[PDB]
Design a protein around this ligand. Structure first.
Ligand SMILES: Nc1ncnc2c1ncn2[C@@H]1O[C@H](COP(=O)(O)OP(=O)(O)OC[C@H]2O[C@@H](O)[C@H](O)[C@@H]2O)[C@@H](O)[C@H]1OP(=O)(O)O
Length: 292
């Protein structure tokens, strides 16, 4: 299959590598055009894939069977809209990122729009990407109009196992969002590893009470206790890690906060829910951001 991968960062190079290894015809797409896309990825078995791949070829884009989008949330919707007039109107667009609210920005996309999440881990070390952990990728329809593109899960399962189609991808994304609304801003504000959050059960539960209220009203049934329990399992699993948001703060990069607690705020507003703690996290990270 012919794929354009938008984003040639860690996740993009993971997908580009896996795709090349199965003989799919690929290119990269870079927001800041460069003559080619550098892929330099060390697999779980220590093998190296180091390859310069085509980038930003509009004819390749125009005949691609899939646009696979691996940008950070705040980069996604502008980049996708800028390509959508070139991409054939039947060609699916699959977004994989953390955070939510890009779909709300892509309502007028005429292409099938899909969203995805994965538990693969790919970490940048220098100019090298390391495939740290294998995992599971779930994809499904982004909006109610988007139909059955499960064939894409069947193809991608042979590229980067495991992949499954989930019509209720949106419920899964909300549950991930709930965890992200806790771990990311608290770690970024407190400049601590994820496991330190254990010591703030009151603040966690309060964030979870707020998120559960919003999720409930969005039509997905959940509990503050269920979200808290999932937050603690994720914290337990990543106790020593430095969060992506804290890494962003430490490196003086723009964060994903507008698509994490920011998105929660926009959805809370729309349902008349008061979210005082999420608001504080959001404003605090925004303050930290505009010191650099
Ligand atoms: N397992 C996953 N499941 C669903 N989404 C994932 C997963 N892993 C990452 N992503 C997301 O894809 C988007 C792109 O992530 P990367 O490929 O890591 O971005 P990029 O490579 O541009 O940035 C990575 C290097 O350059 C810095 O921007 C960053 O801190 C890192 O050292 C973000 O929303 C990234 O999420 P986040 O910003 O790392 O929380």
């Amino acid at each position: 299959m012919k794929i354009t991968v938008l984003g040639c960062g860690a996740l993009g190079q993971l997908w580009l590598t896996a795709l090349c290894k199965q003989g799919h015809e690929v290119q990269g797409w870079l927001r800041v055009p460069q003559p080619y896309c550098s892929v330099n990825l060390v697999e779980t078995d220590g093998s190296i894939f180091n390859e310069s791949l085509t980038a930003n070829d509009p004819d390749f884009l125009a005949t691609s069977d899939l646009l696979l989008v691996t940008l950070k949330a705040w980069q996604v919707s502008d980049a996708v809209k800028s390509l959508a007039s070139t991409l054939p109107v039947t060609t699916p667009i699959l977004l994989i990122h953390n955070g939510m609210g890009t779909i709300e920005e892509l309502q007028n996309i005429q292409q099938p729009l899909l969203m995805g999440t994965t538990t693969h881990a790919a970490r940048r070390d220098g100019n090298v990407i390391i495939h740290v952990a294998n995992g599971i990728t779930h994809i499904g329809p982004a909006r109610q109009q988007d139909g059955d593109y499960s064939y894409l899960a069947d193809i991608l399962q042979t590229v980067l196992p495991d992949v499954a189609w989930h019509n209720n991808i949106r419920a899964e994304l909300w549950r991930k969002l709930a965890v992200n609304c806790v771990i990311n801003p608290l770690t970024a504000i407190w400049n601590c590893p994820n496991g330190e959050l254990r010591h703030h059960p009151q603040e966690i539960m309060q964030i979870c009470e707020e998120v559960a209220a919003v999720i409930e009203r969005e039509g997905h049934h959940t509990s503050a206790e269920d979200l808290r329990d999932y937050v603690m399992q994720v914290i337990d699993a990543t106790a020593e890690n430095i969060s992506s948001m804290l890494q962003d703060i430490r490196a003086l990069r723009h964060t994903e906060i507008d698509y994490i607690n920011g998105f929660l705020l926009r959805r809370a507003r729309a349902h008349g829910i008061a979210v005082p703690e999420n608001t504080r996290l959001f404003e605090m990270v925004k303050r930290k951001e505009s010191e650099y």
